[PDB]
Ligand binder design. Sequence first.
Ligand SMILES: *[C@@H]1O[C@H](CO)[C@@H](O[C@@H]2O[C@H](CO)[C@@H](O[C@@H]3O[C@H](CO)[C@@H](O)[C@H](O[C@H]4O[C@H](CO)[C@@H](O)[C@H](O)[C@@H]4O[C@H]4O[C@H](CO)[C@@H](O)[C@H](O)[C@@H]4O)[C@@H]3O)[C@H](O)[C@H]2NC(C)=O)[C@H](O)[C@H]1NC(C)=O
Ligand SMILES: *[C@@H]1O[C@H](CO)[C@@H](O[C@@H]2O[C@H](CO)[C@@H](O)[C@H](O)[C@H]2NC(C)=O)[C@H](O)[C@H]1NC(C)=O
Ligand SMILES: *[C@@H]1O[C@H](CO)[C@@H](O[C@@H]2O[C@H](CO)[C@@H](O)[C@H](O)[C@H]2NC(C)=O)[C@H](O)[C@H]1NC(C)=O
Ligand SMILES: *[C@@H]1O[C@H](CO)[C@@H](O[C@@H]2O[C@H](CO)[C@@H](O)[C@H](O)[C@H]2NC(C)=O)[C@H](O)[C@H]1NC(C)=O
Ligand SMILES: *[C@@H]1O[C@H](CO)[C@@H](O[C@@H]2O[C@H](CO)[C@@H](O)[C@H](O)[C@H]2NC(C)=O)[C@H](O)[C@H]1NC(C)=O
Ligand SMILES: *[C@@H]1O[C@H](CO)[C@@H](O[C@@H]2O[C@H](CO)[C@@H](O)[C@H](O)[C@H]2NC(C)=O)[C@H](O)[C@H]1NC(C)=O
Ligand SMILES: *[C@@H]1O[C@H](CO)[C@@H](O[C@@H]2O[C@H](CO)[C@@H](O)[C@H](O)[C@H]2NC(C)=O)[C@H](O)[C@H]1NC(C)=O
Ligand SMILES: *[C@@H]1O[C@H](CO)[C@@H](O)[C@H](O)[C@H]1NC(C)=O
Ligand SMILES: *[C@@H]1O[C@H](CO)[C@@H](O)[C@H](O)[C@H]1NC(C)=O
Ligand SMILES: *[C@@H]1O[C@H](CO)[C@@H](O)[C@H](O)[C@H]1NC(C)=O
Ligand SMILES: *[C@@H]1O[C@H](CO)[C@@H](O)[C@H](O)[C@H]1NC(C)=O
Ligand SMILES: *[C@@H]1O[C@H](CO)[C@@H](O)[C@H](O)[C@H]1NC(C)=O
Ligand SMILES: *[C@@H]1O[C@H](CO)[C@@H](O)[C@H](O)[C@H]1NC(C)=O
Ligand SMILES: *[C@@H]1O[C@H](CO)[C@@H](O)[C@H](O)[C@H]1NC(C)=O
Ligand SMILES: *[C@@H]1O[C@H](CO)[C@@H](O)[C@H](O)[C@H]1NC(C)=O
Ligand SMILES: *[C@@H]1O[C@H](CO)[C@@H](O)[C@H](O)[C@H]1NC(C)=O
Lengths: 53, 440, 128, 128, 128
Amino acid sequence: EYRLINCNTSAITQACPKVSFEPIPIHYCAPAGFAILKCKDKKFNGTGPCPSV
Amino acid sequence: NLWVTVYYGVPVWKDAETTLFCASDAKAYETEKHNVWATHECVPTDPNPQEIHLENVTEEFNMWKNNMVEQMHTDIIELWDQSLKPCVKLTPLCVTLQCTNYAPKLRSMMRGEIKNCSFNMTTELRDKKQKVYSLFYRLDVVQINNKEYRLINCNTSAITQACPKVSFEPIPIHYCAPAGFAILKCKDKKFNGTGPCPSVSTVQCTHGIKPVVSTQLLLNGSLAEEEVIIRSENITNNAKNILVQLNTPVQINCTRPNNNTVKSIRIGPGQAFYYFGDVLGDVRMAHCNISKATWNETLGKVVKQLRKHFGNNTIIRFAQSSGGDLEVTTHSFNCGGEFFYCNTSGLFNSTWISDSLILPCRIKQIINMWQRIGQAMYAPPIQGVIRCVSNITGLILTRDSTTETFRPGGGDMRDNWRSELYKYKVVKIEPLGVAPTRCK
Amino acid sequence: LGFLGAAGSTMGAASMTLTVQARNLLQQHLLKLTVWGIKQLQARVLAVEHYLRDQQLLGIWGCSGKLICCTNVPWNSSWSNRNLSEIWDNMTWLQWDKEISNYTQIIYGLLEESQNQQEKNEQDLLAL
Amino acid sequence: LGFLGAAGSTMGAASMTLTVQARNLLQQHLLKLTVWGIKQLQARVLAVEHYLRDQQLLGIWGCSGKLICCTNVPWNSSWSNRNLSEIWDNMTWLQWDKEISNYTQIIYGLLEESQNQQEKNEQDLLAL
Amino acid sequence: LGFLGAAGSTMGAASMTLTVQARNLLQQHLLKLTVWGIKQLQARVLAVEHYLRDQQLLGIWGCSGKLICCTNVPWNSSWSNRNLSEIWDNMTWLQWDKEISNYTQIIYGLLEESQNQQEKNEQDLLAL
Ligand SMILES: *[C@@H]1O[C@H](CO)[C@@H](O[C@@H]2O[C@H](CO)[C@@H](O[C@@H]3O[C@H](CO)[C@@H](O)[C@H](O[C@H]4O[C@H](CO)[C@@H](O)[C@H](O)[C@@H]4O[C@H]4O[C@H](CO)[C@@H](O)[C@H](O)[C@@H]4O)[C@@H]3O)[C@H](O)[C@H]2NC(C)=O)[C@H](O)[C@H]1NC(C)=O
Ligand SMILES: *[C@@H]1O[C@H](CO)[C@@H](O[C@@H]2O[C@H](CO)[C@@H](O)[C@H](O)[C@H]2NC(C)=O)[C@H](O)[C@H]1NC(C)=O
Ligand SMILES: *[C@@H]1O[C@H](CO)[C@@H](O[C@@H]2O[C@H](CO)[C@@H](O)[C@H](O)[C@H]2NC(C)=O)[C@H](O)[C@H]1NC(C)=O
Ligand SMILES: *[C@@H]1O[C@H](CO)[C@@H](O[C@@H]2O[C@H](CO)[C@@H](O)[C@H](O)[C@H]2NC(C)=O)[C@H](O)[C@H]1NC(C)=O
Ligand SMILES: *[C@@H]1O[C@H](CO)[C@@H](O[C@@H]2O[C@H](CO)[C@@H](O)[C@H](O)[C@H]2NC(C)=O)[C@H](O)[C@H]1NC(C)=O
Ligand SMILES: *[C@@H]1O[C@H](CO)[C@@H](O[C@@H]2O[C@H](CO)[C@@H](O)[C@H](O)[C@H]2NC(C)=O)[C@H](O)[C@H]1NC(C)=O
Ligand SMILES: *[C@@H]1O[C@H](CO)[C@@H](O[C@@H]2O[C@H](CO)[C@@H](O)[C@H](O)[C@H]2NC(C)=O)[C@H](O)[C@H]1NC(C)=O
Ligand SMILES: *[C@@H]1O[C@H](CO)[C@@H](O)[C@H](O)[C@H]1NC(C)=O
Ligand SMILES: *[C@@H]1O[C@H](CO)[C@@H](O)[C@H](O)[C@H]1NC(C)=O
Ligand SMILES: *[C@@H]1O[C@H](CO)[C@@H](O)[C@H](O)[C@H]1NC(C)=O
Ligand SMILES: *[C@@H]1O[C@H](CO)[C@@H](O)[C@H](O)[C@H]1NC(C)=O
Ligand SMILES: *[C@@H]1O[C@H](CO)[C@@H](O)[C@H](O)[C@H]1NC(C)=O
Ligand SMILES: *[C@@H]1O[C@H](CO)[C@@H](O)[C@H](O)[C@H]1NC(C)=O
Ligand SMILES: *[C@@H]1O[C@H](CO)[C@@H](O)[C@H](O)[C@H]1NC(C)=O
Ligand SMILES: *[C@@H]1O[C@H](CO)[C@@H](O)[C@H](O)[C@H]1NC(C)=O
Ligand SMILES: *[C@@H]1O[C@H](CO)[C@@H](O)[C@H](O)[C@H]1NC(C)=O
């Protein structure tokens, strides 16, 4: 006798067999009164003053 | 000769309804993740109590038409409903119960009270069932005619597991009004309930309010400041209830002195509920204590306030409450996971002319909060013992020749909050003004 | 005094407190939706238009910017002609305001017509 | 006439109706969420910025407050030079407006540059 | 240059770029509610008051409309008296701003009191 994994812990949802999963490129617009900075410095450390902002 | 001169920023208002929102005192909780009252996702209170006094101005209030009551009583039902939603529905619980008494050889008041029971509970598999032994109370099961028992709910409502990580401790809540509005404050001692407070002031955001649920009395509340204060709406009517505020508290101790055991059974793929498994030690009644001589001295202050404007040459007779549901009959309160029902017949057996005390207390499991037939919450049991200590602040009465009967009443939860919102009303600021002056 | 500090005061005494009345108008970014987030969203909205609807009216009435300005329409003395030198610095704002209240609608449409219709044409009439 | 009362009228005749056009802009407190409460929430929002985005523009164009004001940038006569004494009080607003419509973007950036860039410096240049 | 184009520039050089800084402030009608509609609703709101709270302040400070205007309160020279002819067109806005930052709260309440309380009474005092 076998048994599924989920029944230990969770419940099961059918995954809607018409939708897809292809990762669409997403842009992120900031609202007004705000801005998004950009480093643009090559070889950026992770934490440092980007000069070419 | 005179022309109309406009004015902006005039200190003048009207009275209006508006939406109004939370304000928490910012703490570091991080234990029960979120309680029933959403203190998380609430704005932290400014620790600057800006309380601006108003000079030589009066305003008649009404504690009987505060829409702040109806806004908050909407919200307390709704927050309760909101947190109760994502937990386990005990749909397959409503089965036929084989039961018997738990301590069959017992002489005390607890005889025939706790009932051992038996199930066929559906497991997480579809075709596997399970015989389950558990314990229940008299006030949860109903006979059908080891006679077959059945729960109360299945007459009317459905069952939700009560999310056994959250708490129920009433956090003090402040109410900040939005901009362009203000909240008035009476500040007059011995305020009638409807009258011009002379000593008014105003704030943006009220003081702490603990939204406790209680019947027949007012636990944990706010004190008075001068004496016993009586309030009602129509003192000559028998339909209006009676609001009593006390200048001093009474320290009530309450306990559920049983060392218990909670078991757990997965009943679905993730649905695992908790039930009152076993009692260590032996079975003990739950009760509450009160200083008797303090309370008579407390009650002696009350009748003096009664005989001022009502029944001077007339006896004052207290009777036990009449009957109906337990919520409208007896004292009922949550105290952090348990719902007590303490009989209060030993506090209303008294008349007047011209060494502690013990109240027996019952507890339930299945709760019908705010008289909503359709909803029924199953609280989980709690391990260990309960050691609730509380004050008292208020009293809810009703009036039934030269004889007077005062029976203890309750029922509407909104009357709990009129005891906290009589000091306030909501005004809409008007920054306009037009006067004639000497300029063109 | 403070915000609403001169509430039961003389109109001339409460003339010099308008800045504190106007500063104490209009937080948490990244709201959720559940219960209190609705009210805080409602708190953000109601502060806007109740600030703004009269802010429209001063542009309607030509008294743009914070000015205790006066118009060119004469005061009609049918509107409780009571010692307008004397009573202007006697009673309060408050009790005087509901006395005016039966005719304030009649005033306002004349305000937007008196100098706001007429005297806003005539500078174009001399703009040659 | 009324709100939009002078719609098909002379521009000079419809010059003297701007107050009724502006009064008839911008209720129920304590909203729920269900269906119509969404739209009434959406009704409150859209009235704000559509009132406000041009209200920004008059501060951009320096014509703050309700004024039929004029600029200092000259009219370019390449933009349909048609009898600007005659046609200015002949046709309508309406049919004249779409004639202008191909160049209005070009106008507006020059408006914020002409007196709004230049003539807003020079009072500081004489502020000594 | 462009929006924020003169960011690391001279304050006098970056004096003449304020219009591009103000135009690039504040779509889709008929929103749903689901996920992104929440954020776009939140995007509409936050643009309003962050435009508006300082727009209140210029009316508070009497500098209504876009004006680089100056007050009548004197500069207290305890606030880093550093060559105020020289340094005013030397460094930047940016690094100079955090130098001022410890006292800006003290300034602003004096701004609404200096000409905004006092000099807004006295035209009524000569209005006779
Ligand atoms: C009126 O006001 C008074 C204030 O004076 C209130 O009295 C206080 O009530 C609270 C709660 O009833 C009580 O707090 C308990 O104190 C114990 C001793 O420190 C704590 O051990 C206990 O914490 C446990 O329970 C909490 C709730 O479940 C949990 O949040 C907490 O993490 C602990 O839980 C662990 O332990 C239990 C043990 O069974 C276990 O089941 C859990 O799973 C977990 O492992 C309480 O916090 C105060 O001590 C009371 N103060 C006084 C002076 O008495 C009174 O309640 C108010 N009246 C009313 C009606 O509310
Ligand atoms: C409830 O009653 C049942 C009756 O069967 C009890 O179950 C038996 O208890 C005895 C001693 O307690 C055990 O020796 C048996 O093995 C139990 N039977 C089964 C099938 O397990 C049960 O103990 C009672 N509940 C409590 C809490 O005492
Ligand atoms: C306290 O409230 C009561 C009502 O609950 C007031 O009683 C009536 O008040 C009205 C108006 O003041 C009078 O016309 C009635 O004659 C009063 N009836 C009685 C039986 O007193 C009472 O006046 C209030 N008291 C104060 C001091 O405000
Ligand atoms: C319950 O009542 C007691 C008094 O009977 C309160 O204790 C007082 O609390 C105030 C406010 O913190 C203190 O100033 C007093 O010194 C306290 N008195 C004593 C004797 O301790 C207590 O705070 C009340 N508790 C609740 C939860 O209401
Ligand atoms: C308060 O309730 C009393 C009843 O106890 C009302 O008094 C009677 O009201 C009925 C109906 O209005 C009248 O027919 C009687 O004549 C009243 N009796 C007296 C002695 O007045 C009273 O009207 C109620 N008052 C308020 C303010 O609600
Ligand atoms: C309720 O219980 C608490 C403790 O269980 C009582 O507190 C004690 O009170 C006595 C006298 O009042 C003091 O001498 C003790 O020091 C107190 N102990 C603690 C730990 O506080 C309280 O008095 C009880 N209340 C009543 C009405 O009996
Ligand atoms: C609280 O306890 C009292 C104890 O007396 C109960 O009162 C008794 O109730 C029964 C049922 O009606 C009567 O037959 C007795 O005559 C009552 N006793 C007395 C002395 O009157 C009371 O029922 C209990 N409270 C509740 C809600 O059940
Ligand atoms: C259930 O989970 C436990 C750990 O949570 C794991 O040890 C066990 O193997 C799991 N059982 C099944 C059937 O997956
Ligand atoms: C449980 O099921 C068994 C067999 O189906 C039956 O004999 C027993 O009476 C049932 N007990 C209960 C409490 O339903
Ligand atoms: C069901 O409700 C009715 C009244 O609504 C009541 O008389 C009856 O006793 C209830 N039955 C059970 C089993 O609780
Ligand atoms: C309850 O029983 C357990 C059994 O291990 C014991 O550890 C605990 O101290 C008991 N608690 C009380 C309050 O008796
Ligand atoms: C309560 O006190 C009063 C006087 O203070 C007395 O007449 C009465 O008998 C007392 N009652 C009890 C139950 O002690
Ligand atoms: C009231 O108390 C007395 C004794 O204190 C007792 O004899 C009497 O039966 C009681 N009556 C009620 C209604 O509780
Ligand atoms: C003043 O108002 C009255 C009505 O109260 C009106 O009859 C009268 O014509 C008005 N006076 C003027 C000058 O408009
Ligand atoms: C007027 O617009 C035309 C384009 O239609 C352009 O070529 C011309 O230079 C403009 N005149 C002026 C003075 O800018
Ligand atoms: C300038 O600020 C200092 C504090 O840094 C203060 O002591 C001094 O009085 C201020 N000067 C004036 C003229 O207000």
